[PDB]
Design a protein around this nucleic acid. Sequence first.
DNA 1: TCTTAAAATCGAAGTTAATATAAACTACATAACAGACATAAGAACAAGTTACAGACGTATTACATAA
Length: 110
Amino acid sequence: RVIYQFPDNLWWNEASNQVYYAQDPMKPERLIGTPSIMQAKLLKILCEYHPSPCPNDQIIKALWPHGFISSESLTQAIKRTRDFLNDEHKTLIENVKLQGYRINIIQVIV
DNA sequence: TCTTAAAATCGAAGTTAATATAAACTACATAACAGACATAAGAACAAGTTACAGACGTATTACATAA
């Protein structure tokens, strides 16, 4: 069981894959829900590289290894992924130009 | 009305390029010239302040796909 903490008391439980709000990681309070398989993919690419930024080419290759996909698809994926993780202030995942995207992780429980 | 000394005038252009002799010593004040210093003016570097450009990222809409 691997669980990741995000700012504003957010948690994501990967093994069962639930995003939620909870003061206690073992006791959820408000369940945001289940991210999609490609959404979990997106958080995977942002998560395996912390604290280093994940380059745009690497995430694009990983998400769609066999698809002719434009970078606009990656960017709208980030946007409509914020649509689900409710990061209105762009603080959960930071976009730094010509260097890629990052996700702010407070702690990891394994 | 008659001598007698002065006064004035005497062609244009053109060219032309000059000369050439004949007190010393001392005392003082002033001007000039040189060097060095201070000052004002400019050159160089670096920083700060500010808006705009350039491409990226985002947001929005419409087409396609899935139920």
